[PDB]
Design an enzyme around this catalytic site. Structure first.
Site, PDB file in Angstrom:
ATOM      1  N   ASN A 197      -7.422   2.594   9.755  1.00  0.00           N
ATOM      2  CA  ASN A 197      -5.978   2.733  10.350  1.00  0.00           C
ATOM      3  C   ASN A 197      -6.218   2.734  11.811  1.00  0.00           C
ATOM      4  O   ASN A 197      -6.983   3.418  12.402  1.00  0.00           O
ATOM      5  CB  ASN A 197      -5.307   4.085   9.945  1.00  0.00           C
ATOM      6  N   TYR A 206      -4.253   2.096  15.739  1.00  0.00           N
ATOM      7  CA  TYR A 206      -3.002   2.073  16.752  1.00  0.00           C
ATOM      8  C   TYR A 206      -3.377   1.922  18.193  1.00  0.00           C
ATOM      9  O   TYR A 206      -2.542   1.104  18.914  1.00  0.00           O
ATOM     10  CB  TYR A 206      -2.198   3.311  16.451  1.00  0.00           C
ATOM     11  N   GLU A 224      -3.518   0.229   8.172  1.00  0.00           N
ATOM     12  CA  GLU A 224      -2.739   0.708   8.806  1.00  0.00           C
ATOM     13  C   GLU A 224      -2.670   0.315  10.258  1.00  0.00           C
ATOM     14  O   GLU A 224      -3.378   0.276  10.963  1.00  0.00           O
ATOM     15  CB  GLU A 224      -2.408   2.115   8.856  1.00  0.00           C
ATOM     16  N   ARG A 270       0.858  -1.215   0.015  1.00  0.00           N
ATOM     17  CA  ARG A 270      -0.120   0.019  -0.105  1.00  0.00           C
ATOM     18  C   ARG A 270       0.812   1.016  -0.017  1.00  0.00           C
ATOM     19  O   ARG A 270       1.653   1.519   0.825  1.00  0.00           O
ATOM     20  CB  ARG A 270      -1.025  -0.058   1.110  1.00  0.00           C
ATOM     21  N   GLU A 283      -7.240   9.173   6.165  1.00  0.00           N
ATOM     22  CA  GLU A 283      -7.267   9.574   7.523  1.00  0.00           C
ATOM     23  C   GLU A 283      -7.833  11.208   7.245  1.00  0.00           C
ATOM     24  O   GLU A 283      -7.036  12.228   7.583  1.00  0.00           O
ATOM     25  CB  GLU A 283      -6.252   9.801   8.246  1.00  0.00           C
ATOM     26  N   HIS A 308      -2.419  11.578   0.593  1.00  0.00           N
ATOM     27  CA  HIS A 308      -1.992  11.323   1.779  1.00  0.00           C
ATOM     28  C   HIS A 308      -1.151  12.372   2.318  1.00  0.00           C
ATOM     29  O   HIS A 308       0.094  12.436   2.560  1.00  0.00           O
ATOM     30  CB  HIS A 308      -0.906  10.103   1.529  1.00  0.00           C
TER      31      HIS A 308
END
Ligand SMILES: OC[C@H]1O[C@@H](O)[C@H](O)[C@@H](O)[C@@H]1O
Ligand SMILES: OC[C@H]1O[C@@H](O)[C@H](O)[C@@H](O)[C@@H]1O
Ligand SMILES: OC[C@H]1O[C@@H](O)[C@H](O)[C@@H](O)[C@@H]1O
Lengths: 448, 447, 448
Positions: free
Chosen positions: C290, C292, C351, C76, C165, C120
């Site tokens: 994405n 985390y 991600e 990606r 995002e 991005h």
């Protein structure tokens, strides 16, 4: 009366490898049964061969430009087995595969949908030396061949045909011997038909394992109409119908072999293992219909083996191949096929067209073929009628894009909407091609 | 086994300016090579074709040498300017008489005369009218052809029109290393076109007034991949198109290679439809001149194909710097068979190699083991090609005699018969002796 | 406990253009907002910029070999808008497009699926001079840019991301000014968010018109957990949740903007025309997550503008970016996301990864990062758990393939499973990369 076609209805034209490519044994390409057959005296009209044909192997780019000029949305073509795998099994021929690689990329770049046929009558001679379609192992051989293509063109060729016209292959190639490999045997015909069906099933399974998209078979159908009210003529009709139109469709639909075949082939008829029919009936995604005409069979005790013969329909026009022009029978057939497949199987007319005399060269840059134009317009209208009757018809491919080698009848039978001067390889778009381009552009509205 | 097909024709080849000498003798006209070779800097060591092998005077001796070699055919060219001093107009009786005597003498010995109309020696008078840049040459050539066609009717049955169009145009008009020494892509394109047209015109004239078989002779140098890098493959196709397909494709009715538009850029031209009709005039046979292969890689500054050969250090190289690689011959023959559809009879009209030999014989001998090796391996390669279905009818060794290798002078010896250029003494080399045995056993000696 | 993943489950790794490429204004490439932002003193840690980064523009071939060593099935990456269209609109830059052309062909040759992201965070500066994401015309600008890619890579890039995002872009770029273009305004934040959503919609429509394959947006989500039973803390949680996790997702699902935003942004909040929401909700084929970490927000009256703040969860490990390690929250989020999309939209983790300290050079050819390995194994297990709970998850991309520029935090935060020595550009595969390679090879069985 409107004739606009459904959204997404796909317009195109069709060809076959041995009929147009030439360079049959060039760049590593193997020997096929037609290489042998066409170079045996007496087999082909005027001694014509597919050695050069339309020289498409070298002139495919020009041919793609012609496809663009005709506004084609799809191109149906076949892949030569022996060009890709010279011995049928084993080592791949890189240059041969690279040809179809370039071809398909060129088509996609042109915005044209590639419709690929695995087998269009050109079996590798090395496999014929192992018995060809009489050897059951061919089911595996075919599958392996299929796999090579499925993975090579994964994501590029989304619509796949397995076998083009099992009936022509077996009846012409094994029963009467008018086509390669030129055998004449009912015993061999029964076996060959069965193994062709098995090969189709095996290819479908392999496609489920490694392939992507839709897969199906392509059948030719020639509807048999009643000649009279005599019961013997009706029995004749049913024999002809069973041998030509139901022989392959029925086991594909899980109905077994037509019982009339027992009478048609007699001592040559066989019973086959039950699991074979399971393999043969492997669920498909779509089906192709090749259609040209109808027949009106009457009883003919000396006609081997169907004991039937067509009655000439003198009230209608006939093509250069002697096929009656009768558009309503297309509509009927489509309806019939829709019914035999339960309406659940998406259909496409993968071949329809007509052969008329054209001069060997263009005349002031033109080829005037009004009868081919007429055939085209009436039969496309017949497609519209069939759709109006609920047939799930997704597309139409004209046979053929180019004047080509009409197998054993040689170059004398021109089916192209594009004329090929076989002396110079010059292409000239016929009036029929111009009109078809108009049909595509207006999505049928020009027929109004 | 390596026995060759029945009727397979064995011979050797020469060209007029390379062997004849006496370029201005007995009415003979001035050619472009008379001019070119007498301009300082053009020829190695200042060599000229003034004497060469003195074949004009020693042709009988040379024929006796052919007999010692068991030759069944002799391929030679006729000097246009020797026969027609101004290229057009008056015939030169003695000049034509030379070839009359030569051909009759060959027939007496049982050797088949294979005649080439044009082997690079254009009459200077036609050059002053533009040479191959003038379309009228197509007619001029045709007329010239006719003179020969009628003169040797029934005696010379196998005719070549043009020997190696690529060398003529690329060497003569594109880079200027050969006569007439022009350097221009524009002229190269026009000249190539008119060479092909001239061939066509000559073939038509042959149909109307000639007897036998007629064809062109192409040199082909197969282009192999240097790497899997795409720019190198594009380079390979540029080189292949410019050298190997430029002439063959329009001869087979497929037009000019697309890549040429890229190679020649603004110098490329569109030509009228009827020209290609003339060019593809059906022939009876084709000659292949073959020596080696190349392995082209991308070279942006190499004009005009933007490609260059990669030295193949794994193999032997000739004194002309050509890689020794017999399999590429087999491949090429097959390739050629496929490009012409197998319907056209093929003949290797030239094949051979240049290695150093001393300027004189050594106790009556010349030992050339590398030329012997080239000969045996490449003839075996011919056998292999026939085994793959190529309709190959014969083989002519370049060359019968050590001769003038054009701009490279006499330093490049191609003969299977050694020529001492100080004394005109001929000595048959070991390669010649071996070739004689190859012919006599019809190939069985190779077993 | 088995951890075998579903058939066709796609394993890969992810990067972004400005974070790895370098050569930012090379070969015709235009100036981006990050070119400007990173070269303004005070904006970047240690004064780091993206001028060199991983020098990927020059070393992409080596990086592909690295992908192969890691057994990656997908890569990606993002395309730099200003590299392809230097002024954002108008003339295309041939060399810039040619880079991504070579990259994509190289990926396909290696058997690696290219997953392309249109935007991005690297807007062309020329468009920023026209108001950037505050100018409604950007919806069109983006679409045109999208088209250029859609057609250039038709049939080669089958999986497309539109925006990476939206929340980081708007909250970082327009609300607080920690990211380019460094604005700090609630008014601008509201407008920018709206226009990012609109741009996504426009790109999807354009993709339907000229593109081929599957297209979707990529959202980051940070699940907000309860800090206490105090009602003001739950109100805080809902404010934070609305501003971060629901702001973009809800209108994308046709639910309009979260009500709480009216409270969060106050006088800066606006009503937008109804058709905008028709555009924003254009049907997509897939969605990227994405992920985390999580947060545990409590009420914080002086915190602008959500009036909430995270409570440090000292019971768990924290990454070098200060993010709590809590794998179950990944599972929860996926489930939550599955519920918000009705289970109908195919999901992919675009991600996931962690930043821990690594030395600037390898130590005898190795980088030992046991905590990154741990993060990887536990979160991938969490993926499996999520699938067992009915999430339609088709793939997983590790952030990141390479140690790279962590935007405003510079090179101090290493997310790579491949170590980059920024002094020498030497790559060294970390223990985490080795382990991930084994995870891909065994399709999850190594976790057993
Ligand atoms: O007979 C005309 C055509 O019939 C079709 O059914 C076959 O598929 C073609 O190969 C053939 O050219
Ligand atoms: O280079 C060696 C030989 O090449 C041949 O193809 C030419 O026809 C000769 O003139 C030349 O001497
Ligand atoms: O903030 C850390 C990371 O956040 C991700 O979601 C962005 O896509 C990356 O570019 C960034 O490195």
């Amino acid at each position: 009366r409107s004739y606009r076609f459904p959204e997404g209805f796909l317009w195109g034209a069709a060809t076959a490898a041995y009929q147009i490519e030439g360079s049959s044994m060039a760049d590593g390409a193997g020997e096929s049964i037609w290489d042998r057959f066409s170079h045996t005296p007496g087999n082909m009209k005027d001694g014509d061969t597919g050695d050069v044909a339309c020289d498409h192997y070298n002139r495919w780019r020009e041919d793609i430009e012609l496809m663009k000029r005709l506004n084609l949305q799809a191109y149906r073509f076949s892949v030569s087995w022996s060009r890709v795998i010279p011995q049928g099994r084993g080592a791949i021929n890189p240059k041969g595969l690279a040809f179809y690689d370039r071809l398909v990329d060129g088509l996609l770049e042109a915005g044209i949908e590639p419709l690929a046929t695995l087998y269009h009558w050109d079996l590798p001679a090395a496999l014929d030396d192992r018995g060809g379609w009489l050897n059951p192992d061919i089911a595996d051989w075919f599958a392996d061949y299929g796999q090579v293509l499925f993975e090579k063109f994964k994501g590029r060729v989304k619509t796949w045909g397995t076998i083009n016209e099992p009936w022509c292959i077996v009846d012409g190639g094994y029963l009467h011997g008018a086509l390669a490999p030129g055998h004449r045997s009912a015993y061999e015909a029964v076996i060959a038909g069965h193994n062709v069906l098995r090969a189709h099933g095996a290819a479908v399974r392999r496609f489920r394992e490694v392939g992507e998209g839709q897969i199906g078979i392509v059948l030719n159908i020639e509807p048999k109409y009643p000649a009279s009210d005599k019961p013997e003529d009706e029995a004749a009709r049913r024999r002809a119908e069973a041998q030509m139109n139901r022989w392959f469709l029925d086991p594909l639909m899980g109905r077994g072999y037509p019982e009339e075949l027992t009478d048609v082939y007699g001592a040559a008829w066989r019973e086959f293992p039950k699991e074979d029919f399971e393999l043969i009936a492997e669920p498909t995604d779509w089906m192709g219909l090749n259609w040209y005409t109808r027949a009106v069979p009457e009883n003919a005790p000396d006609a081997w083996p169907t004991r039937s013969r067509p009655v000439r329909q003198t009230q209608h026009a006939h093509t250069e191949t002697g096929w009656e022009v009768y558009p309503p029978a297309l509509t009927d057939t489509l309806v019939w096929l829709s019914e035999q497949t339960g309406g659940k199987l998406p259909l496409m007319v993968t071949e329809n067209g007509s052969a008329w005399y054209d001069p060997p060269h263009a005349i002031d840059g033109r080829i005037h073929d009004p009868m081919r134009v007429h055939y085209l317009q009436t039969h496309i209208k017949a497609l519209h009628d069939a759709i109006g009757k609920g047939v799930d018809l997704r597309g139409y491919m004209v046979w053929s894009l180019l004047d080509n080698l009409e197998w054993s009848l040689g170059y004398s039978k021109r089916f192209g909407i594009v004329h090929v001067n076989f002396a110079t390889q010059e292409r000239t778009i016929k009036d029929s091609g111009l009109f078809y381009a108009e049909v595509i552009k207006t999505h049928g509205d020009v027929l109004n």
